[PDB]
Structure 1
Amino acid sequence: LDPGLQPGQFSADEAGAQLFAQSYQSSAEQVLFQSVAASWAHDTNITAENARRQEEAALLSQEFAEAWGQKAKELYEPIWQQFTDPQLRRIIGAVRTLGSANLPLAKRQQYNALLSQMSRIYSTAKVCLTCWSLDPDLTNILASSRSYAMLLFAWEGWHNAAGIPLKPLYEDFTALSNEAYKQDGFTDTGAYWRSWYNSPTFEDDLEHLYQQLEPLYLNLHAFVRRALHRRYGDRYINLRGPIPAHLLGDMWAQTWSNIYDMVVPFPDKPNLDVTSTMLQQGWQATHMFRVAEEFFTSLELSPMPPEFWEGSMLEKPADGREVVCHASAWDFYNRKDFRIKQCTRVTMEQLVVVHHEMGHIQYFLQYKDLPVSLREGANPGFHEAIGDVLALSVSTPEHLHKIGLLDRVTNDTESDINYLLKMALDKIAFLPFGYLVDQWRWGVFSGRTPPSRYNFDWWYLRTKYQGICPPVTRNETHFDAGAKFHVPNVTPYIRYFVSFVLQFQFHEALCKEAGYEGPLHQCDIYRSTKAGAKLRKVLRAGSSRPWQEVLKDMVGLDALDAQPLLKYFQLVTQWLQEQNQQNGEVLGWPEYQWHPPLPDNYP
């Protein structure tokens, strides 16, 4: 560790810890910057040399974290929890958590190499017939093909190509991760991840939320299943069994927006799939990012800085480079460099992803002057919700008309049902998937799910919650959890379930602050500077205060609550129940063992 980056001495009291935290701040920004920069160089240019450089940067980060972590415990272990300054407690509490820096050198190097190899495997996997990549080739197949056989080839090809080689690395990663966090006092890595929410009843509270939401999903599922049956027939769709996992428009069946044309109940109302109009009008990636920015500035939030426009990667490179295409937002921890890396495609769903990522950037901009340990969301679900809340306003038929994507305007019951059904295909279909991913991972970290049951327990949960089945037989050579980005890239997932509930609480509060008095699902907070100011107070807080209190200041309640989501969807919830009843549907999938047959002469 360079001399300028090492911790000195400080007195063993609160006045000293304050000076300790200020000296830490200075050197942490340098160490974090070099680590984020090396990660950027690799993720926009996957090469063996760039991976080597990223591993060396990660090792330096661990050396820094150990030195300052050990100094914090040396001086403050018996007194930090009684400090008067609540922000200083949170800073010291974070610095004394070493994570992977608890491992000995040889195991640190093994850990860093596993992260690098798992990332490379996921983002360079191909399906060959001449080879298709996930983004854009396989993505476009899953969204627009209606050939059962072509969808099956793409789904099976991707899951085999990405998942099978990841499994031995993921086993080794799990054991090293658990060994590291056991030294911080956690029973396993999952217990450390859940601790970020500072709620002793976290798992029960989530289960109670899902009980309120499940009927809405069961009814959307049965309605969509019926539509698929009319197109694919009784051989490939069982009206009392799970839906084949490759027929819902998306590689993970996690958002169903791309099958809207098969389910839309009132098709002579205005056409809400505005992707065609974006194409017809010549929208490109940079248009999409500028339109998102202007929503933020309409609220008197910050524009994107020059450093963002000069540094970001907003299209997939055409120069034969391998990149990580999965969209992401970047804080370089120097209060100046902020970027997005996205292989942007011209579609309405991608316009929503652009808003999602710009919400992350806006948080970074607003909390950049806090101490580095407090530059995070009040909890991770807050960070995930910011951009989605603004996109709820952008998606409204009224707002799409204002930006030239919907010429005709209607305000009637049929048009509302169309809109709420389209929104449900995104927000309601996702809920079981958002909930189940970390149930799977918590069981792997705790040891309830050993390697011998990775795929058995994954498909148990996929069927239990989403009501889908794999369209070809799977066994424990397959590792289908690994074919989802966040698993090999070690990103937690329960934050997205939390976000999809929270964003409707945020929306209701901002709409009220803006003075809006119509139906919640027709609110558009565009140009509301009062709503902007309420949101800004959240963003500028970072993690300096307990999330329960920040939430109470914003929405008037100190807990997650499903009521605003239920209020938003109420009209289509009622309508779908009526339709399924009149159609005589069975809600659920009691033929839980059913799988579809293979196509004749496949492949």
Structure 2
Amino acid sequence: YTTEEEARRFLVKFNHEAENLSHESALASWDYNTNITDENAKKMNEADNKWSDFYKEQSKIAQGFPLQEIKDPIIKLQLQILQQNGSSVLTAEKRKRLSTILTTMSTIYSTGKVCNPNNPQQCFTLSGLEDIMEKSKDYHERLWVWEGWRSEVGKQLRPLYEEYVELKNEMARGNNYKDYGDYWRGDYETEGEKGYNYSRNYLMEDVDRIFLEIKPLYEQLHAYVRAKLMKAYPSHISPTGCLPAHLLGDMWGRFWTNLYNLTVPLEKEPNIDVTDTMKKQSWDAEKIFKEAEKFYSSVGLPNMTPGFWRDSMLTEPSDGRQVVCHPTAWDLGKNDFRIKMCTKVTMDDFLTAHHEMGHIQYDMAYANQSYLLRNGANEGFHEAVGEVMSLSVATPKHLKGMGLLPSDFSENNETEINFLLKQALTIVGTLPFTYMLEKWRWMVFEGKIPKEQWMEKWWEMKREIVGVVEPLPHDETYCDPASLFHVANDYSFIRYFTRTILEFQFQEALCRTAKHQGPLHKCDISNSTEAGKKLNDMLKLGKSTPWTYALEKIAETKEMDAKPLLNYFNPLFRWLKEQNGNSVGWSVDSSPYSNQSIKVRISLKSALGEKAYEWNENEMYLFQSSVAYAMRVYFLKAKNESIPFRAEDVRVSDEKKRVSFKFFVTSPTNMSDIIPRSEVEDAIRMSRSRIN
């Protein structure tokens, strides 16, 4: 007589009291975020402590209920989400150790600093450092700063990260999952039945196929970028080699947009600039919001409730309480919607406001489902919904048709090319990097490669896929990949790729209904209702259904594809086909320090036999010291100069145990290419068996 209605009643029970408490917690958080005061910290603490206490008590009382007896998928999803133990199966000491090490890593990342030998009393933090990286135009200084930051941050992050990954893998193994990689992979499909055969492991080959398909366009773009880059820095780029890592204009290389200034086809044609009209009209902060509301209502979706316009944060507080301008779409529930942002008069502000309003209007549509299901189907839809509208609104034709941008502008067959190139330098540039980083993190996690091969694997990979070569050889003690942000905060880093694909997937699918004629980049979401009906049908589902069902609802396909993406870039592909029609590709061998080093052949230990020994480190020590002494005496021999060469002036590289070395020497304080081959060759020839 129990069946599963006991679950039904228990569900109703937490439904009664979850919403209100969530409301007070969220309003306390907003109150802090608006006004910064000490008492607000105590308020949030006394709210969140009891909020988490309610989480823990309800979880511990909900654990005993069985799962295999559940038949209805709707309640089964909620029960499976709820009936989770996770880290609770871990003993306290290691849990607190994990928390402490995570906090230590965050703190050590937050307080970096790199200082030059020339003026050791002046130097920067990450902010001014990034500013210099963005503005500077000197090869030497940029290489220097990148190397300095990487060395300083890496040297203090090896053992901590090693222990972190060890403990995480142990936790994942103890949580019934094969590896932490599985645990992250235990999401983002986690379903499929009666029409859907797919499981967790299939994602690997899905992304592999997608990247393989997308490769050629990126290869062509890379060819063009390499061809153009040699203008700025001659005698540094091999015609068939890769590119220096530090020359990608950004700290890491996640975005290439900053290179646009250098790859502009020509400066003869000015771009679109209509800031004058709004600046002279001086639109109020509310005018843009009202216009955006009119635009969105033009497609049929319901407009926001009047109560929203009262409780809001449209303008600058103009009060002593300092606030941050990072746009946010606070969804408090119970039809309490608020937007936090400071408003100015710029196109970027316009598109950001449109994005935030898209966020909030998507959130509104599904308010009546439940509490636990108040979420997106995956990690990509929520941002995709805003991104599609943001892409649509920027089209010049609509801007001309809505009142701004008068008809005194005749577009040509090159301006759209410039717009497409600008979009491509960001939409596609980050895909190889994201793929490479995610793959490397996975394989490190499950333990396929031992710890000692981390850095030797990393640079090989960067040579293979992305097409970037290290500026200077790096030994094993470094921990380059930890210098990033998302690496040091244990944030899942797969959403970006799938989000970028689904964006254009939805764009093409929806534009299909509009019955456009020309290239997809000219599509519009102007007056229409069937498109709005389809969009509402998509959004209202929420988390109650598998996402593949949603794609079938619009995309009518059970999987993703790059065909819409390449179709959207077809004019760009044809334009680029006429510029690099002779050569394209790379070789994973060449490098800047390739024509400068010396072979330094190695004699076999067994050939010597007597008085022979394996390195066990500590011996290239002697080689470096001896060659440094030889160089010091060499300069005194005829050059009559007093350069105090040091021990760490010899660069080990490309070692195979007892099989080979390679090295070259650099000046104490101007390490770019100095001390060419001939000088060191003469110096080493001069000396005698005092070395070997």
Match of 2:176 in 1: 185
Structure richer in helix, relative to its length:
1
1:398-426 Cα offsets, whole Å, 9 max, x none, are: 35656858996444432332222221111
The corresponding residue for 1:492 is 492
Which digits, 9 at most, give the CA deviation of each residue in 1:359-395, with x for residues without a partner?
A: 5544433334433332222221222322221222234
Does 1:377 pair with 2:376? yes
SS of the counterpart of 1:463?
helix
Change (3 A) 1:15 1:388: same
Find the aligned partners of 1:346 and 1:474 in 2 and give their Cα distance. 47
Offset at residue 565 of structure 1 (A): 0.6
C-alpha separation between the residues in 2 aligned to 1:539 and 1:87? 18
Shift of 1:568: 0.4
Q: Within 5 Å, which residues of 2 pair with 1:566-585?
A: 566-581=566-581, 584-585=582-583
1:21-53 per-residue CA deviation (whole Å, 9 max, x = no partner) reads 333345555776788789889999999999999
Please list, as runs of the form range in 1=range in 2, the aligned pairs for 1:462-501 lying within 5 A after superposition: 462-501=462-501
Distance of 1:458 and 1:291 partners within structure 2: 49
Contact 1:367–1:539 (CA under 8 A) maintained in structure 2: yes
Inter-CA distance 257–327: structure 2 relative to 1 (3 Å threshold): farther
- 1:104-140 deviation digits (Å, cap 9, x = unpaired): 44444444444444444445545566654545x4444
Q: Structure 2 CA distance, aligned partners of 1:148 and 1:549?
A: 52
Task: Return the offset for 1:442.
Answer: 1.5
Conserved 8 A contact 1:65-1:101 = no
- TM-superposed CA distance for 1:16, in Å, is 1.8
2:66 corresponding residue in structure 1:
76
Counterparts of 1:242 and 1:558, CA distance in 2: 38
Maintained 8 Å contact 2:243/2:467: yes
Q: 1:187 to 1:168 in 2, by over 3 A?
A: same
Number of equivalent positions: 584
1:312-327 equivalences under 5 Å are: none
Compared CA separation, residues 223 and 403, structure 1 to 2 (3 A):
farther
Counterparts of 1:10-409 in structure 2 under 5 Å?
A: 13-26=3-16, 28-29=18-19, 67-80=57-70, 83-84=71-72, 86-123=73-110, 125=112, 132-134=124-126, 137-156=128-147, 158-160=149-151, 165-198=156-189, 199-200=198-199, 201-235=202-236, 237-265=237-265, 267-271=267-271, 296=296, 299=299, 300=301, 336=336, 359-399=358-398, 409=409
Query: 1:307·1:337 contact (CA, 8 Å) conserved in 2?
Result: yes
Q: Is the 8 A contact 1:255 1:430 kept in 2?
A: yes
CA distance in 2, matches of 1:43, 1:479: 36
Following the alignment from structure 1 to structure 2, what is the Cα–Cα distance between the partners of residues 259 and 279? 29
What letter corresponds to residue 366 of structure 1 in structure 2?
Answer: A
2:470, 2:309 → 1: CA distance?
A: 41
The answer for the alignment partner of 1:586 in structure 2 is: 584
Q: CA deviation at 1:141?
A: 3.9
- 8 Å Cα contact 1:254-1:429 kept in structure 2: yes
Give 1:552 shift: 0.8
Contact between 2:62 and 2:83, CA under 8 Å: does it hold in 1?
Answer: yes
Tell me if structure 2 keeps the 8 A contact 1:427–1:500: yes
Mapped contact 2:63–2:84 kept (Cα < 8 A): no
Instruction: Judge conservation of contact 2:337–2:360 (CA < 8 Å) in 1.
Output: no
Structure 1 residue aligned with 2:195: none
Contact 2:455/2:479, CA 8 A, preserved across alignment: yes
In 2, are the aligned partners of 1:504 and 1:565 still within 8 Å (CA)?
yes
- Alignment partner, residue 652 of structure 2: none
Letter of the 1:588 counterpart: W
Range with greater deviation from structure 2 (302-311 or 331-340): 302-311
2:135, 2:357 → 1: CA distance? 27
How far 1:184 sits from its partner (Å)? 4.2
User: What is the deviation of 1:548?
Assistant: 0.5
Distance 2:523 2:365 in 1: 25
Post-superposition offset of 1:357: 5.9
Question: Measured at CA, do residues 261 and 322 of structure 1 come closer, stay the same or move farther in structure 2, by a change above 3 Å?
Answer: same
Normalised by the length of structure 1, the TM-score is: 0.79
What whole-Å deviation, never above 9, does each CA across 1:521-570 have from its counterpart, x for those lacking one?
12232565543443333333222111111011012212111111111001
The 10-residue stretch of structure 1 (29-38 or 255-264) with the greater mean CA deviation from structure 2: 29-38
Partner of 1:230: helix, strand, or coil? coil
Distance 1:127 1:291 in 2: 47
Amino acid at match of 1:95: L
- The structure whose Rg is larger is 2
What per-residue deviation string (whole Å, max 9, x for no partner) do you get for residues 272-296 of structure 1? 6999999999999999988877765
- Structure 2: tracts of 5 or more residues without a match: 117-121, 190-197, 597-665, 673-692
Matched, 1:522 2:509: no
Q: Percent identity?
A: 38
Residue 228 of structure 1 deviates from its aligned partner by 0.9
Once residues 318 and 452 of structure 2 are traced to their aligned partners in structure 1, the CA distance between those partners, rounded to angstroms, is: 40
Deviates more, 1:519-528 or 1:351-360: 351-360
CA gap of 1:525–1:67, structure 2 versus 1, over 3 A, is same
1:262-316 per-position Cα deviation (integer Å, ceiling 9, x unaligned): 2233544451699999999999999998887776555436559987997879999
Decide whether aligned partners of structure 1 residues 350 and 230 sit closer, same or farther in structure 2, where only a CA change above 3 A counts: farther
1:322-366 CA distances to partner (integer Å, 9 max, x unpaired)?
Answer: 98x987766567763666689x99987787666666655444333
Structure with the bigger RCO (C-alpha within 8 Å, sep 6+) is 1
Amino acid at match of 1:504: F
Letter in 2 for 1:439: K
CA 1:422/1:484 → structure 2, altered by over 3 Å: closer, same or farther? same
- Partner of 2:585, secondary structure, is coil
Further displaced range: 180-189 or 55-64: 55-64
| C-alpha spacing 1:408/1:302, structure 2 compared with 1 (3 Å) | same
Q: Matched residues in 1 for 2:562 and 2:245: separation?
A: 27
RMSD: 4.7
Q: Distance in 2 between matches of 1:269 and 1:165?
A: 50
Residue segments in structure 1 that go unaligned for 5+ positions in a row: 1-10
CA distance in 1 between partners of 2:23 and 2:100 (Å): 20
CA apart distance, 1:441: 2.1
Counterpart of 1:553?
553
Distance in structure 1 (CA, Å) of the matches to 2:241 and 2:577: 19
* Larger mean Cα displacement after TM superposition, 106-115 or 37-46: 37-46
Change (3 A) 1:22 1:472: farther
Residue identity matched to 1:18: R
Kept in 2, the 8 Å contact 1:308–1:340? The answer is no
**8 Å CA contact retained: 2:256, 2:426:** yes
Paired residue secondary structure (2:512): helix
